[PDB]
């Protein structure tokens, strides 16, 4: 792991490395010439507000006073301009850490005001920031005069801070070795001038976050034991002290460079970490970037642990590999993601971890490093750092290439909303009073909706366990421009503010009906009567009895089909507490196959009920208590109806459905009286099964009926007969007999027939198909029935992906467990994404991973090759490779069916439709027009044939228990029943209500292929015609001609339809 | 460095203090698996009669299993350490280790275990 | 139109059960004893038809192989058996002149149209009947007759 990470950090270094002639002289030229002009600037007199306005209206350039601008009745001071006194480079360029980032990067350029312009109280009430804006305005006007009008310029904000307005210059052209600087869109893209303050002029101890530095009330803000009365403004205080202390930070950072020059690749890897994790130094993205990463790395060089011993993986004689492992470990575990908001703080040198206070404190300066960061971004970093911890903690699979993207902040549940708080007193329930204007640094609505939805969706159990339906939250201010032009003072917006709510859900308690609270008080406690409960709820406060004899303040939600109770939560509480700004969620994927039971749609109970409860009562205990010449050894259910993979969560009755007959392997004890011939072994299996059947019919559950039918799933085995048991509640169960000498004799049949020299391929396919039928399905279903308790999105995710492959017509050749392990690849090894807390998110994850996987060099390994790739370089026999610890061969569910594999077949089409899915989701978005995903194109087909079924209306959907076809009235209630389908004869008319094209295309999957190969909606395994025989699909076959048959010679081993030429 | 450590080990193989120095460098480079590898290398290649060096490697590995390990690994190494060394002494070392680490509840469970098992002959 | 090829199976028959047959290639869809007796009686001057053995069709519906290609315990070509020598020679001189009626001087439209047996509802649905509901008396009798 370690040497691989070293060499992979080196390859990314030589890939994102730089050019020396680019750096010097391309940046150096403009740096020197801009400093020349900024020193040829002249200084003006100390002028008041009226002179400032009087020149600012007449000149083209405007000031940047943030709201609110100071009036002349509140402004008694004077503002001046003076000659700049200093020059330094800051950020990443003075440290030489910069990398070629394809979008942009900005080199920040300090200029510091002289000390004679300021007054010792100017850190009170917005004065110094007004002088700062005026200094910037004069620098602006005179640089417009001395550039002779050739370079363009815009107004911006530094790090998204609305209290630091800045200017960023943009070029337009490129020559060889002149001024102009366009082609370097990383280093020479942006030169952001920053106005700052000198060092140690304002009292930092009063610049502490807990002191309120905006005085608005003067009546009653005393006699309260110090200063809790004047409320603390941490964003404003921290911003002021950071603007005055930009300098000695870079001094300390340069010190850390020359004490360890591994800082280069250190913050290179940290910067690519942040750029891929989608954050930044912008306050909209959390305000965590290269600067914070560097200064946290520095203080963790000079300490960090509790006993102030040095950070053990951070001695100055290490490399960037272990340095980045150290930072991801510390950011995950000690006090640097969410713990610096809930349970502790850090110190600067000598650095320590103490168990109090939300702050990233530095002491000699009195500054929070995490002032732009909230608890939202905190828990986000905690998740990301835990993921990186386990990804660099594993030691079998390479994890340098996977880098995390925020599926938690961009889920499928993009609840867009339009909230127009104009006017504020009538369209916002929280009063944005002058106190709120002082506290919030123009992010009041953000903090408000953060707290509102977090307390809205958090629950509280009875044992004190703080369990919620959410773990993360972030508001993304879409259409928030940080750049504006030269003729306007603020950044105004006329289209309102869009508020995006991206929540990573908790699937263990997502779909729970009950919302929980505190003990329903004898006297109403403040927790019962706060802004989290009965007042905050209103009409949904009630009293509900538990299963544990305590009675608490509770809620009762609804469990429904097309959307979620969390969607109901957010709609109702948003409309109540922010305002009536509307909510819509129209991403339709919950319209799956809808099972016909009580309370549509039933949650994870119906599959359980029918399969498991009818399995227990009654056939299993009865079959184990029968008397027989041979005793049974195991009764293990191996179906999707147990393992949560069935396309239809089954009901009581549906003998017309595909996956309703439940296949289970049965076996008897070790007995040597089985014969040595396969036909004889299968006939003794039949005879034993007939004894079981007669006793099952003669005992008192004789309302169950049995029958012994033949099977044709295997080739060259025509004597296989089962017992499908028809339970009194309409369940179906196919039993099969597995024998050790049966396995060894079929290995012998694969062994012999050496003379003809051309039988070993078909012998191998029949052997592997037989092993698939009998051996490994036990271990598969035990593993996934174990995994379903920790991953609850699995069965609806499998239903979505198998529905997509069904409407695209490929699962006739694709086995269902192939699709199962393909989705468990996105589930159980979820890197580089989060856990799928929605079935929709899981479906999109499989779709995008299948869009970004190639079958040519990358195999699929999932934690639930070099002898095959060499003999198959063009891979005409095998396209996929899915190997586990359960199967290390990787060819067990892939090449046993005999999938044709040129570039003009099922597999390449599968690849192409996944690509087109990724294209359309990337291009137009997620809207109502997504259903081009679920309609098929029917292109690239040589001959097309439409078929029609001889059924009456609402057939077969009503007996496959799915509820489209409004023409059958009552599909949303309980009108359909199957105890009348429970038949009187086993002949027609019981199997006449089945669908014929399924087994027609089994014969049309039983003879040709050497002529042609087709795929239709029929033989789609464990799926009937219904959802593709409604409007959502159609009954078609599309037959393509293989490229191997164009024209050939007259043979006898021809098989095809050839004509004379 | 690891090559320096291997050179000083081929110079002095029985040297438990250098063994713990090498695995402690592996703690500083966070490779606890290679630290286990080094500890078992000490347990094999440290010679038969050097009981004090063996118990030094043992109690260091117990420090690892209480500090960075988990319950199952600390109990299996406790079993192996009493299987190959003195039960009373490895129990008292884990007790003082619990005293140092502050894990006082499981410390109390170990104390009642050792006054049950070895209160018959130890007054200490 | 469907083309049917006819060559002599006579120069490679050492087995007595393959006596006096015809090597057919590309038998049409659902080619059975009924389609064969219909075509041999529609050919004029022809003897008697008995049996098609080795009727494992390998074309007219999709998949990798056929159904009975390997003896599991230990090419769509059929073996059409006729009455005797005279019936074989008559069907040879009849299929020869049919292959010449491809270019017959009135028109080539005098060729025989091959009427299919289309899979009707229940007639095909006996496939569902044999996968799930066969006759237990016959199944019991067969399994006891072998297991005895």
The DSSP annotation for A245-273 comes to THHHHHHHHHHHHHH-TTHHHHHHHHHHH
Two structure tokens written together for C7 = 């060559």
Do B29 and A329 make contact, defined as CB atoms within 8 angstroms?
no
| Alpha helices (H) in A671-759, listed in sequence order | 678-698, 740-751
Token representation of residue A316: 């100055």
Chain A residues near residue C26 by CB distance under 8 angstroms? 1057-1058
Q: Does B24 touch chain A (CB under 8 A)?
A: no
By CB atoms closer than 10 A (0-12, 13-18, 19+), residue B28 is middle
Q: Quick one: A263 exposed, middle or buried, by C-beta within 10 A (0-12, 13-18, 19+)?
A: buried
Of A322, A329, A395, nearest to B29 by CB-CB distance is: A322
Evaluate whether C4 touches C70 at the Cβ level (below 8 Å): no
Q: Is the peptide bond before A567 cis (omega within 30 degrees of 0)?
A: no
**DSSP assignment string, A364-423:** TTTEETTTT--HHHHHHHHHHHHHHHHHHH-SSS--SS-----TTTS-S--B--EE--SS
Among A686, A987, A1007, the residue with its CB nearest the CB of C60 is: A1007
Structural contact between residues B35 and B74, judged by C-beta atoms closer than 8 angstroms: no
Interacting residues of A216 by C-beta distance below 8 A, sequence separation 6+: A434, A435, A438
Instruction: Give the number of other Cβ atoms within 10 Å of residue A336's Cβ.
Output: 26
Chains B and A touch (3+ CB pairs under 8 A): yes
Alpha helix (H) residue ranges in A891-977? 906-923
| DSSP one-letter code for A186 | T
A709/C134 touch (CB, cutoff 8 Å), yes or no: yes
- Report d(CA A861, CA A110) in Å as an integer: 52
* Largest Cα span, chain A: 113
Q: Does C109 touch chain A (CB under 8 A)?
A: no
Distance from CA of A308 to the nearest CA of B (A): 16
Given CB atoms, is A874 within the 8 Å cutoff of chain B? no
Touch between C and B (at least 3 CB pairs under 8 Å): no
Parallel, antiparallel, or unpaired for β A1036-1041 and A1012-1016? antiparallel
Could you list the beta-strand ranges (E) of A469-579. Answer: 475-476, 483-484, 497-498, 500-501, 514-515, 542-545, 551-556
**What SS3 state is found at A566?**
helix
- DSSP secondary structure letters along A826-880: HHHS-TTS----SHHHHHHHHHHHHHS--TTT--EE----TTTTTT-SS-SS---
Experimental technique used?
cryo-EM
Q: How far apart are CA C71 and CA A49, in angstroms?
A: 105
Q: Are A534 and A455 in contact (CB under 8 A)?
A: no
Q: Evaluate whether A378 touches A337 at the Cβ level (below 8 Å).
A: yes
Integer Cα distance of A135 and C148 in angstroms: 109
Nearest to A325 among B27, B30, B33 (CB): B30
Residue A565 to residue A513: CA distance in whole angstroms: 8
Q: How far apart are the C-alpha atoms of A611 and A659, rounded to whole Å?
A: 12
Q: Are A420 and A427 in contact (CB under 8 A)?
A: yes
Tell whether B106 lies on the interface with A, counting CB pairs under 8 A.
Answer: no
Whether A455 and A488 have beta carbons less than 8 Å apart is answered as no
- What distance lies between CA B57 and its chain's CA centroid? 5
Bridge-based pairing of strands A514-515 and A551-556 is: antiparallel
**CB-based burial, A43-63: b 16+ in 10 Å, e otherwise:** eeeeeebeebeeebeeeebbb
Asked whether the beta carbons of A365 and A248 are under 8 A apart, the reply is yes
Give the chain A residue whose CA is nearest to the CA of B32.
A393
Residues in chain A: 1061
Q: Cβ separation of C63 and A749 shorter than 8 Å? A: no
Residue A254: which residues within 8 A CB-CB, separation 6 or more? A94, A95
Q: Which residue has the tokens 């006729």?
A: C82
Compute the distance between CA of residue A692 and CA of residue A729 in angstroms, rounded to an integer: 20
Look at B30 and A322 and tell me if their CB atoms are within 8 Å.
yes
Instruction: Name the 3-class secondary structure at C55.
Output: coil
Kindly state the tokens that stand for A407.
């599926």
Task: Give the bridge partners for A353, in sequence order.
Answer: A346
C59 touches chain A (CB under 8 A): yes
DSSP A70: P
- DSSP helix/strand/coil, A554: strand
What's the first-to-final CA gap in chain C, in angstroms?
Answer: 52
**Preceding omega of A989 cis (within 30 degrees of 0):** yes
Q: Which residues pair with C82 in a beta bridge?
A: C49
- Shortest distance between the Cα of C83 and any Cα of chain A, in A, equals 26
Q: How far does A313 lie from chain B, in Å, by closest CA? A: 5
Strand partners, A732: A661, A726
Could you give the CA distance from residue C81 to residue C48 in angstroms, rounded to a whole number?
Answer: 9
Q: How close are the terminal C-alpha atoms of chain A, in Å?
A: 64
Q: How far apart are CA A308 and CA A300, in angstroms?
A: 10
Whether chain B has a CB inside 8 Å of the CB on A355: the answer is: no
Which residues of chain A lie closer than 8 angstroms to B28, CB-CB?
312-313, 315
Contact A1052/C131, CB-based, under 8 Å? no
Q: What is the DSSP letter of A192?
A: E
Cβ neighbourhood burial of C135 (10 Å; 0-12, 13-18, 19+): exposed
Tell how strand A882-883 and strand A860-861 pair up: parallel
Instruction: Specify the DSSP element, H or E, that contains A332.
Output: helix A320-333
Q: Are A387 and A479 in contact (CB under 8 A)?
A: no
Inter-chain CB proximity C63 and A1014 less than 8 Å: no
Q: Is A129 helix (H, G, I), strand (E, B) or coil?
A: helix
What does the alpha-carbon distance between residue A348 and residue A362 come to, in Å, rounded to a whole number? 5
Q: Which of A679, A683, A716, A947 to mutate to test the interface with C (most CBs of C within 10 A)?
A: A716
Q: Do B30 and A313 touch (CB under 8 A)?
A: yes
Backbone dihedral angles phi then psi of residue A359, each to the nearest 5 degrees:
-170, 140
A433: how many CB neighbours lie within 10 A of its CB?
11
- Environment class of C28 (CB within 10 Å of its CB; exposed 0-12, middle 13-18, buried 19+): middle
Distance of alpha carbon A570 from alpha carbon A475, whole angstroms:
14
**What span, in angstroms and rounded, lies between the C-alpha atoms of C117 and C123?**
10
Spatial distance between the Cα atoms of A479 and A497, rounded to a whole number of angstroms: 7
In Å, how far is C29's CA from the nearest CA of chain A?
11
Half-sphere exposure of C43 (CA within 13 A, CB side): 24
Query: Looking at beta carbons, which residues of chain A come within 8 Å of C136?
Result: 690, 707-708
End-to-end CA distance of chain B: 42
CA distances from A1005 to A290, A657, A1045, C19, C117 (A): 60, 20, 19, 34, 19
Of the candidates A709, A717, A986, the beta carbon closest to that of C72 is on A717
User: CB contact, 8 Å: B30 with chain A?
Assistant: yes
Q: What is the helix (H) or strand (E) element at residue A764, kind and residue range?
A: helix A760-774
Contact assignment for A395 to B27 by CB distance below 8 Å: no
Quick one: which of A1055, A1036, A1038 has its CA closest to A997? A1036
Distance from C-alpha of A1042 to C-alpha of A903, rounded to nearest angstrom: 10
b/e per residue, B77-94, with b = 16+ CB within 10 A?
bbeebbeebeeeebbbbb
Cross-strand pairs, A869? none
**C-alpha distances in Å from residue A605, one per residue of A510, A610, A611, B97:** 15, 9, 10, 49
Are the beta carbons of C62 and A708 separated by less than 8 Å?
Answer: no
Reference A660, options A373, A912, A960, A393; nearest CA is A960
CB A329 within 8 A of CB B30: yes
* Cβ neighbours around A434 below 10 Å, total: 12
Chain A residues lying within 8 Å of B29, measured CB to CB: 313, 318, 322
Chain C closest CA to A691's CA: distance in Å? 10
- Residue given tokens 């360029």 in the structure block: A93
Residue A271 and residue A293 in contact, taking contact as beta carbons nearer than 8 Å: yes
Cα–Cα separations (whole angstroms), residue A240 to A138, A232, A1018: 21, 14, 70
Could you tell me which of A865, A887, A877, A763 has the C-alpha nearest to residue A818?
A887
B118 exposed, middle or buried (CB, 10 Å; 0-12, 13-18, 19+)? middle
A437: left (phi over 0), alpha (psi -120 to 50) or beta: alpha
The answer to whether the CB atoms of C139 and A749 lie below 8 A apart is: no
Those residues whose C-beta lies under 8 Å from the C-beta of residue A298, and which sit 6 or more positions away, are A252, A253, A256
d(CA A862, CA A824): 7
Residues 293-322 of A with CB under 8 A from B: 312-313, 315, 318, 322
DSSP at B31: -
Instruction: Identify the CA nearest to C19 among candidates C86, C85, C102.
Output: C85
Nearest to A194 by CA among A112, A277, A310, A286: A112
- How far apart are alpha carbons B44 and B48 in whole angstroms? 9
Chains A, C: CB contacts under 8 A, how many? 131
Dihedral sign from CA coordinates of A268, A274, A277, A278: negative
Checking DSSP bridges between strand A632-637 and strand A88-89, what pairing results, if any? Answer: unpaired
Tokens 């403040």 — which residue?
A: A526
Closest chain B C-alpha to A330 CA, distance in angstroms: 12
């Amino acid at each position: 792991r370690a040497r691989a990470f070293v060499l992979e950090t080196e390859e990314m270094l030589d890939s994102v490395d730089l050019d020396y002639s680019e750096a010097f002289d391309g940046a150096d030229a403009l740096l020197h010439r801009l400093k020349g002009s900024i020193e040829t600037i002249p200084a003006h007199d100390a002028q008041p507000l009226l002179d400032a306005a009087a020149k600012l209206e007449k000149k083209h350039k405007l000031k940047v006073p943030f709201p609110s601008p100071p009036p002349p009745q509140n402004s008694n001071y004077k503002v001046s301009f003076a000659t700049p006194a200093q020059f330094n480079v800051v950020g990443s360029y003075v440290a030489k850490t910069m990398v070629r980032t394809q979008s942009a990067h900005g080199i920040d350029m300090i200029v510091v005001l002289p000390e004679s312009i300021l007054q010792e109280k100017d850190y009170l009430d917005l004065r110094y920031f007004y002088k700062r804006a005026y200094y910037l305005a004069v620098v602006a006007a005179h640089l417009q005069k001395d550039l002779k009008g050739e370079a363009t310029l815009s107004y911006e904000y530094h790090n998204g801070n609305s209290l630091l307005p800045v200017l960023s210059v943009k070029p337009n052209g490129e020559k060889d070795e002149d001024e102009k600087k366009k082609k370097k869109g990383v280093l020479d893209y942006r030169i952001r001038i920053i106005p700052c303050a000198p060092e140690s002029f304002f009292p930092r101890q009063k610049l502490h976050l807990g002191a309120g530095l905006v005085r608005k009330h003067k009546e009653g803000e005393q006699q309260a034991n110090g200063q809790p009365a004047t409320p603390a403004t941490p964003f404003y205080n921290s911003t002021l002290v950071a603007e005055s202390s930009y300098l000695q930070y870079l001094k300390l950072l340069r010190q850390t460079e020359k004490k360890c020059a591994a800082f280069r690749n250190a913050c290179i890897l940290g910067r690519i970490w942040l750029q891929q994790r989608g954050f930044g130094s912008d306050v909209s993205k959390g305000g965590f970037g290269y600067f914070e990463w560097a200064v946290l790395l520095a203080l963790l060089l000079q300490g960090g642990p509790a006993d102030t011993k040095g950070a053990a993986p951070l001695s100055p004689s290490l490399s960037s590999t272990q340095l980045f492992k150290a930072l991801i470990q510390f950011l995950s575990v000690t006090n640097f993601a969410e713990k610096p908001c809930v349970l502790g703080q850090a110190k600067p040198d000598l650095a320590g971890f103490i168990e109090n206070g939300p702050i990233l404190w530095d002491s000699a300066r009195q500054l929070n490093i995490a002032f732009k960061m909230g608890p939202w971004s905190a828990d986000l970093l905690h998740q990301h750092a835990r993921w990186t911890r386990k990804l660099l903690a594993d030691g079998a699979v390479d994890q340098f290439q996977p880098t995390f993207i925020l599926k938690a902040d961009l889920p499928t549940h993009t609840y867009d909303l339009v909230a127009r708080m104009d006017p504020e007193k009538v369209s916002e329930a929280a009063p944005d009073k002058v106190a709120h204007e002082a506290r919030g640094r123009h992010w009041q609505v953000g903090h408000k909706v953060y707290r509102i939805l977090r307390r809205a969706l958090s629950d509280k159990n009875m044992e004190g366990g703080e369990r919620a339906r959410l773990i993360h939250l972030k508001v993304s201010p879409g259409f928030s421009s940080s750049s504006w032009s030269l003729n306007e003072k603020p950044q105004p917006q006329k289209a309102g503010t869009p508020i995006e709510i991206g929540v990573l859900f908790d699937p263990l308690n997502m779909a729970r009906t009950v919302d929980r609270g505190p003990s329903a008080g004898p006297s109403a406690e403040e927790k019962e009567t706060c802004e989290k409960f009965r007042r905050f709820w209103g009409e949904k406060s009630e009293l509900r009895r538990f299963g544990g004899d305590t009675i608490r303040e509770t809620l009762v939600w609804s469990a429904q089909t097309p959307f979620d109770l969390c969607e109901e939560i957010m709609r109702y509480i948003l409309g109540l507490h922010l305002r009536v700004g509307q909510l819509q969620d129209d991403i339709v994927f919950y319209g799956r196959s809808l099972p016909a039971l009580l309370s549509i749609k039933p949650s994870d109970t119906a599959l359980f009920n029918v399969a498991r409860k009818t399995f227990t009562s009654f056939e299993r205990d009865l079959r184990d208590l029968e008397d027989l010449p041979l005793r049974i050894r195991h009764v293990n259910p191996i179906c999707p109806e147990l393992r949560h993979s069935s396309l239809k969560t089954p009901s009581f009755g549906p003998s017309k459905s595909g996956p309703r007959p439940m296949e289970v392997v049965i076996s008897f004890e070790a007995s040597g009286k089985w014969p040595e011939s396969l036909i004889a072994i299968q006939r003794t299996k039949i005879a034993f099964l007939l004894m079981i059947g007669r006793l099952l019919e003669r005992f008192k559950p004789g309302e169950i009926r049995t029958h012994v039918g033949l099977d044709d799933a295997r080739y060259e085995t025509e004597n296989l007969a089962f017992l499908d048991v028809i339970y009194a509640s309409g369940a179906c169960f196919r039993v099969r007999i597995q024998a050790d000498l049966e396995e060894s004799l079929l290995e012998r049949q694969t062994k012999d027939k050496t003379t003809e020299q051309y039988l070993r391929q078909r012998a191998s396919t029949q052997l592997a198909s037989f092993r698939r039928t009998f051996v490994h399905l036990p271990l598969h279903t035990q593993y996934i029935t174990t995994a379903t308790t920790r991953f609850p999105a699995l069965s609806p995710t499998i239903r979505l992906v198998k529905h997509w492959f069904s409407v695209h017509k490929l699962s006739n050749h694709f086995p269902p467990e192939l699709l199962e392990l393909f989705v468990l690849h996105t589930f159980l090894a979820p890197y580089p994404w989060d856990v799928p807390s929605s079935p929709t998110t899981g479906f999109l994850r499989t779709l995008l991973f299948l869009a970004r996987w190639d079958w040519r060099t990358d195999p699929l390994i999932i934690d639930t090759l070099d002898a095959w790739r060499k003999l198959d370089p063009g891979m005409q026999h095998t396209v996929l490779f899915v190997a586990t610890a359960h199967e290390q061969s990787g060819t067990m569910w892939t090449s046993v069916d005999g999938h044709p594999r040129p570039s003009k077949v099922v597999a390449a089409r599968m690849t192409a439709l996944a690509k087109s899915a990724a294209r359309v989701i990337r291009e137009q978005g997620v809207d109502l027009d997504v259903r081009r995903l679920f309609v098929p194109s029917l292109k690239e087909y040589d001959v097309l044939l439409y078929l029609n079924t001889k059924v009456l209306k609402s057939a077969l959907r009503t007996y496959i228990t799915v509820d489209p076809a409004t023409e059958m009235n009552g599909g949303k209630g309980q009108e359909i029943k199957f105890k009348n389908l429970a038949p009187e004869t086993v002949e027609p008319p019981l199997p006449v209500a089945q669908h014929p094209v399924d087994v027609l295309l089994k014969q049309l999957s039983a003879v040709y292929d050497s002529a042609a190969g087709a795929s239709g909606t029929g033989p789609l395994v464990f799926f009937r015609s219904d959802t593709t025989a409604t409007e959502e699909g159609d009954k078609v076959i599309g037959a393509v001609w293989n490229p191997t048959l164009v024209k050939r010679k007259w043979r006898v081993n021809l098989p095809t339809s050839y004509k004379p030429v | 460095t690891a090559s320096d450590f291997e050179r000083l080990l081929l110079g002095q193989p029985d040297s438990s203090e250098l063994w713990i120095a090498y695995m402690a460098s592996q703690m500083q480079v966070n490779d606890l698996s290679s630290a286990r590898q080094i500890a078992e290398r000490a347990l094999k290649t440290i010679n038969i009669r050097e009981e004090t060096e063996k118990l030094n490697v043992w109690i260091a590995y117990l420090n690892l299993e209480v500090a960075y390990g988990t319950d199952e690994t600390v109990q299996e190494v406790f079993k192996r350490a009493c299987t190959y060394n003195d039960d009373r002494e490895v129990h008292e070392r884990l007790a003082s280790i619990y005293i140092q680490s502050g894990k006082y509840k499981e410390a109390e469970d170990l104390f009642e275990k050792i006054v049950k098992k070895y209160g018959s002959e130890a007054p200490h | 139109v469907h083309y049917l090829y006819v060559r002599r199976h006579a120069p490679k028959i050492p087995t007595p059960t393959d006596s006096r047959s015809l090597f057919v290639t590309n038998v049409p869809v659902d080619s059975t004893e009924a389609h064969l007796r219909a075509l041999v009686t529609s050919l004029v001057g022809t003897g008697r038809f008995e049996k098609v053995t080795f009727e494992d069709e390998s074309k007219q519906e999709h998949s990798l192989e056929g159904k009975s290609i390997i003896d599991a315990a230990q090419g769509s070509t059929a073996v059409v058996l006729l009455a005797d020598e005279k019936s074989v020679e008559q069907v040879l001189k009849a299929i020869a002149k049919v292959h010449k009626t491809k270019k017959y001087p009135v028109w080539g439209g005098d060729g025989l149209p091959d009427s299919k047996m289309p899979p009707l509802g229940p007639v095909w649905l006996k496939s569902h009947n044999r996968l799930s509901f066969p006759d237990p008396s016959m199944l019991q009798a067969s399994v006891d007759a072998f297991s005895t």
